[PDB]
Enzyme design. Structure first.
Site, PDB file in Angstrom:
ATOM      1  N   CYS A   1      27.579  -4.423   8.221  1.00  0.00           N
ATOM      2  CA  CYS A   1      26.421  -4.297   7.365  1.00  0.00           C
ATOM      3  C   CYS A   1      26.008  -2.832   7.311  1.00  0.00           C
ATOM      4  O   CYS A   1      25.935  -2.155   8.340  1.00  0.00           O
ATOM      5  CB  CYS A   1      25.277  -5.186   7.860  1.00  0.00           C
TER       6      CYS A   1
ATOM      7  N   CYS B   1     -20.434  -1.029   1.647  1.00  0.00           N
ATOM      8  CA  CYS B   1     -20.408   0.419   1.512  1.00  0.00           C
ATOM      9  C   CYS B   1     -21.813   0.964   1.222  1.00  0.00           C
ATOM     10  O   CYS B   1     -22.535   0.399   0.395  1.00  0.00           O
ATOM     11  CB  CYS B   1     -19.451   0.820   0.388  1.00  0.00           C
TER      12      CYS B   1
HETATM   13  N1  LIG Z   1      21.945  -8.453   8.832  1.00  0.00           N
HETATM   14  C1  LIG Z   1      21.586  -7.213   9.001  1.00  0.00           C
HETATM   15  N2  LIG Z   1      22.246  -6.457   9.837  1.00  0.00           N
HETATM   16  N3  LIG Z   1      20.522  -6.708   8.305  1.00  0.00           N
HETATM   17  C2  LIG Z   1      19.825  -7.579   7.394  1.00  0.00           C
HETATM   18  C3  LIG Z   1      20.102  -7.134   5.959  1.00  0.00           C
HETATM   19  S1  LIG Z   1      19.949  -8.458   4.814  1.00  0.00           S
HETATM   20  O1  LIG Z   1      20.448  -9.760   5.414  1.00  0.00           O
HETATM   21  O2  LIG Z   1      18.509  -8.627   4.332  1.00  0.00           O
HETATM   22  O3  LIG Z   1      20.797  -8.068   3.630  1.00  0.00           O
HETATM   23  N1  LIG Z   2     -17.146   1.024  -1.932  1.00  0.00           N
HETATM   24  C1  LIG Z   2     -16.119   1.304  -2.668  1.00  0.00           C
HETATM   25  N2  LIG Z   2     -15.425   0.338  -3.207  1.00  0.00           N
HETATM   26  N3  LIG Z   2     -15.756   2.606  -2.887  1.00  0.00           N
HETATM   27  C2  LIG Z   2     -16.451   3.752  -2.339  1.00  0.00           C
HETATM   28  C3  LIG Z   2     -15.616   5.027  -2.596  1.00  0.00           C
HETATM   29  S1  LIG Z   2     -14.283   5.202  -1.446  1.00  0.00           S
HETATM   30  O1  LIG Z   2     -14.839   5.038  -0.042  1.00  0.00           O
HETATM   31  O2  LIG Z   2     -13.233   4.135  -1.672  1.00  0.00           O
HETATM   32  O3  LIG Z   2     -13.613   6.554  -1.575  1.00  0.00           O
END
Ligand SMILES: N=C(N)NCCS(=O)(=O)O
Ligand SMILES: N=C(N)NCCS(=O)(=O)O
Ligand SMILES: Nc1ncnc2c1ncn2[C@@H]1O[C@H](COP(=O)(O)OP(=O)(O)O)[C@@H](O)[C@H]1O
Ligand SMILES: Nc1ncnc2c1ncn2[C@@H]1O[C@H](COP(=O)(O)OP(=O)(O)O)[C@@H](O)[C@H]1O
Ligand SMILES: [Mg+2]
Ligand SMILES: [Mg+2]
Length: 716
Positions: A268, A631
């Site tokens: 793999c 907030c």
């Molecule tokens: N099986 C291994 N080594 N990694 C997982 C990749 S996958 O099965 O998501 O293609």
């Molecule tokens: N309360 C909200 N959703 N926003 C305030 C501005 S921030 O903290 O998301 O930068």
């Protein structure tokens, strides 16, 4: 191995809506045309490589018909490898093998940090030159490979003496004991099977185990050999050295396939390079419960894996932790990253356990204040209110304190610590505003621009809904798409969506949905629990600017997506001119909107809806701060009046836009709200301040604000 034509395989993969593999991504028409008749030197085809992706949409990667597949179908594999291993500009590279100077190498035992490590394991994989993988082996050549490997295993020195157990004629009770003991691979890997991993099973397969039972070898399962070192506890130094010595001894008896670009060749693509995976099984239930748990692991160079199914019903919190990287670093680099990353994660679990000793159940656990304060340092003290008022005096005074129902200062800065561009905190309950007043009150004054703090926020003052200081602005459709006005509310007696428990959400939703189901007239409508709503329903309402989004990292790291989606919902009338989000950022968001610019109709519908809802529950409210919200930016009226404003194109001079903004106490957001960009030069244009003024005034400062921002239109 007989598989369908490569072109059939590409159609199946591509038409499968569920498949999101890197195979699908890079198996292009050009690729299929170029390779469809090509054979490797061992007789393999690209079809045999990608076969498994056609029958398992969940698999991310292809496999290889044999070790020469990487070179023979290089255009395909290089693209897949560069992407998966995140290789910069596709300059795939791997340094010469290096395990380090074994005699001087020492890592601290990982049970130093809270004694959480059940067991420690390191494994490698190797390909033996001159033999294919599953798709291209024959029954007789697989057996010859098996004999060549077991022969070299028997000649291993003293510590590695043991017994080879072929898989053929091994009892089903021995095998099932070995698997549960974490010694043996399983039987049921569908990805492996459809890649040809089980052909002629079980011949040519077996397991070697040394007498001490802390070193073992799998022959012809997922690779030619998988070499494994493991023991109880956290003694990584011993586990690593045992592995390294064994594989160096084996290297003299077997020629392992090695590539200057890809390192050691594996079946793999995920395991190329070092092929090294160093892991612990650790008890980390609190770290595991954090919203950004995976990213915290990733950032420390660590991949988390579940262990669900490996224990009895009531055993929880146990995770496999390992170095994420394989390719482009040495073996010593890999196990060093594993050790630093796991130590940091384990230490963080000890800090969480200590800092949240005695906190209410179902209430989000939080990192220590000084830990999050340091992460917040990447934020600007001139833009970020959260950081600007988190002085050393504040940390000293408030570190260790809890509100009556368990909210801390660390809780409310956590979104800022992990999202440094965010500028405001998110509180845990209404009592925060008194308990942590030295931090919150000067922040609140700064944000809302309070000039005389001697006075109460005005009582609720909605005005006379029949004669309003604005009417239909009545445009064309040249500047204003849609007029909208919203307010937040909190229900007394409930923690906020940041840290409230699942059971809290269920009870809150019952209170609110009950009232909403009884709304009459223009406000009559339907309640839609997010638990019963389909994904294309939900995404339609979101893109229609009706529903809140579910992927905001700032709200996520504040705790707002926990136990998803329990107790969240959307209510709206049939026309969708009146809507209510239940338990997003605040307990409630009451919204009025329609197409056009008639602010007065929108405003009137809003106030009527608020009053009707308010009959069934008591909104949290103080003299100093008005209606209390999550907030601090949403205190007071908690009112945000806005239109989506097509300004083609004062955007052109975003400082003529920022000047025309700071000059009205108004705020610019993107087309799809805060933290979004604006195509078209269309801007979410709202009044910035909500506290220190009435609901009429708040909406008028917006009306005047937009009336004017429009008027700099075609004088342009
Ligand atoms: N099986 C291994 N080594 N990694 C997982 C990749 S996958 O099965 O998501 O293609
Ligand atoms: N309360 C909200 N959703 N926003 C305030 C501005 S921030 O903290 O998301 O930068
Ligand atoms: N640190 C560890 N301690 C004990 N067993 C482990 C450890 N890491 C992995 N294992 C075991 O190895 C077996 C296969 O694990 P897997 O995740 O496929 O790892 P690999 O891909 O390295 O073989 C399972 O039984 C798993 O519990
Ligand atoms: N005048 C408007 N017309 C249409 N949609 C709007 C308007 N103002 C805000 N929205 C939408 O409301 C949603 C809420 O986003 P946000 O900026 O978080 O506002 P808030 O949380 O204050 O309601 C977003 O989809 C945004 O595009
Ligand atoms: Mg495995
Ligand atoms: Mg929002």
């Amino acid at each position: 191995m007989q598989v369908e034509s490569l072109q059939n395989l590409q159609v199946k993969i591509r038409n499968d809506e569920r498949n999101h593999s890197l195979t699908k991504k890079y198996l292009t028409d050009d690729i299929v045309k170029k390779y469809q008749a090509t054979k490797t030197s061992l007789g393999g085809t690209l079809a045999q490589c990608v076969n498994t992706n056609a029958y398992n949409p969940g698999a991310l990667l292809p496999r290889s018909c044999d070790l020469n597949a990487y070179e023979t179908f290089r255009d395909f594999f290089d693209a897949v490898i560069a992407d998966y291993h995140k290789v910069p500009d596709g300059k795939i590279q791997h340094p010469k093998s290096n395990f380090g100077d074994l005699k001087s190498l020492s890592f601290t035992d990982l049970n130093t940090y809270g004694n959480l490590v059940v067991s420690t394991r390191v494994r490698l994989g190797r390909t033996v030159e001159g033999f294919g993988f599953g798709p291209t082996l024959t029954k007789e050549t697989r057996i010859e490979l098996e004999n060549k490997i077991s022969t070299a295993l028997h000649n291993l020195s003293g510590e590695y003496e043991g017994t080879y157990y072929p898989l053929t004629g091994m009892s089903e009770e021995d095998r099932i004991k070995l698997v549960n003991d974490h010694f043996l691979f399983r039987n049921d890997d569908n990805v492996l099977r459809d890649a040809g991993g089980y052909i002629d099973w079980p011949t040519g397969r077996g397991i070697f185990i040394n007498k001490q039972k802390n070193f073992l070898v799998w022959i012809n399962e997922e690779d030619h050999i998988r070499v494994i070192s493991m023991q109880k506890g956290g003694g990584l130094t011993a586990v690593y050295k045992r592995l390294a010595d064994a594989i160096q001894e084996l290297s003299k008896s077997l020629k392992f396939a090695f590539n200057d670009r890809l390192g050691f060749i594996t079946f793999c693509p995920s395991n190329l390079g070092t092929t090294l995976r160093a892991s612990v099984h650790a008890k980390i239930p609190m770290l595991a419960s954090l919203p950004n748990f995976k990213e915290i692991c990733e950032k420390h160079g660590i991949q988390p894996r579940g262990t669900h199914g490996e224990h009895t019903e009531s055993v929880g919190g146990i995770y496999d932790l390992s170095n994420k990287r394989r390719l482009g670093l040495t073996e010593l680099d890999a196990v060093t990253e594993m050790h630093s990353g796991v130590r940091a994660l384990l230490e963080l679990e000890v800090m969480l356990q200590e800092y949240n000793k005695g906190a209410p159940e179902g209430v989000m656990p939080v990192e220590p204040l000084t830990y999050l304060a340091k992460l917040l340092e990447g934020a600007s003290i001139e833009k970020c209110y959260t950081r600007k008022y988190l002085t050393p005096e504040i940390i000293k005074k408030y570190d260790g304190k809890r509100t009556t129902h368990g909210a801390t200062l660390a809780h409310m800065i956590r979104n800022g610590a992990y999202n440094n561009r965010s500028i405001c905190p998110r509180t845990g309950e209404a009592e925060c505003y008194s308990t942590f007043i030295d931090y919150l009150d000067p922040l609140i004054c700064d944000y809302h621009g309070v000039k005389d703090s001697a006075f109460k926020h005005p009582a609720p003052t909605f005005g006379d809904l029949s004669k309003l200081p604005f009417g239909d602005l009545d445009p064309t459709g040249k500047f204003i798409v849609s007029t909208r006005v919203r307010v937040g509310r909190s229900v007394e007696g409930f923690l906020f969506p940041t840290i409230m428990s699942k059971t809290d959400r269920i009870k809150l939703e019952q209170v609110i949905s009950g009232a909403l189901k009884g709304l009459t007239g223009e406000h009559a409508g339907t309640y839609y629990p997010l638990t019963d709503m389909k994904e294309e329903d939900r995404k339609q309402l979101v893109e229609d600017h009706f529903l809140f989004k579910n992927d905001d990292p700032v709200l996520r790291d504040a705790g707002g997506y926990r136990d998803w989606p329990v107790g969240r919902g959307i209510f709206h009338n049939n026309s969708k001119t009146f809507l209510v989000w239940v338990c997003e950022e605040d307990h409630m968001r009451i919204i009025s909107m329609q197409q056009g610019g008639n602010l007065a109709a929108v405003y009137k519908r809003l106030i009527e809806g608020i009053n009707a809802i308010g009959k069934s529950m008591k909104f949290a409210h103080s003299d100093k701060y008005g209606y209390i919200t999550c907030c601090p930016s949403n205190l007071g009226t908690s009112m945000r009046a806005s239109v989506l404003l097509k300004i083609p194109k004062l955007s052109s001079q975003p400082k003529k836009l920022d000047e025309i903004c700071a000059k009205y106490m108004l705020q610019a957001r993107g087309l799809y709200g805060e933290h979004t960009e604006s195509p078209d030069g269309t801007y979410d244009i709202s009044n910035k301040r909500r506290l220190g003024l009435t609901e009429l005034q708040a909406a008028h400062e917006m009306a005047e604000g937009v009336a004017k921002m429009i008027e700099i239109e075609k004088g342009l």
